[PDB]
Amino acid sequence: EGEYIKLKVIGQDSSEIHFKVKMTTHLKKLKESYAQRQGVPMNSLRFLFEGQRIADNHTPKELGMEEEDVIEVYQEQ
Template identity: 70%
Template sequence: MANKDSKPEGEGNEYIKLKVVGQDSNEIHFRVKMTTQMGKLKKSYSERVGVPVASLRFLFDGRRINDEETPKALEMENDDVIEVYQEQLGGNH
């Protein structure tokens, strides 16, 4: 494992563990590559909870996560938390 530190250019293939926490405080843990687009994680989460991905908002540090962003681009670290909220639709009632 010591050579992990000696190859900084290999960081793109590193894995990271993320916690995705829903409004019900239910946590689902994901292990993704630093270069994986977040759209893939969003889709996996929505399939696990049985809710369409379009009806969910994913936030990291209070900022909405775009599908094409990666953990590396978002400067995520192990055990960082992604918050998930139901998208508020309508409002005419």
């Protein structure tokens, strides 16, 4: 059984919510949870890893993510 990695999601206001995900988890789930907790529609936000857009069906494995990596959230363009 694989382990959770813990990712830090940084908001435009520098707030942080951390999420534990497995390496094969689709990141849509993280995006939806984050948007829910911010009180905004998921499609109003864009989520970036090292500046690149995170797709709904990206996984941490596909993105090469590791423990304590950062996701930045910006308003959708």
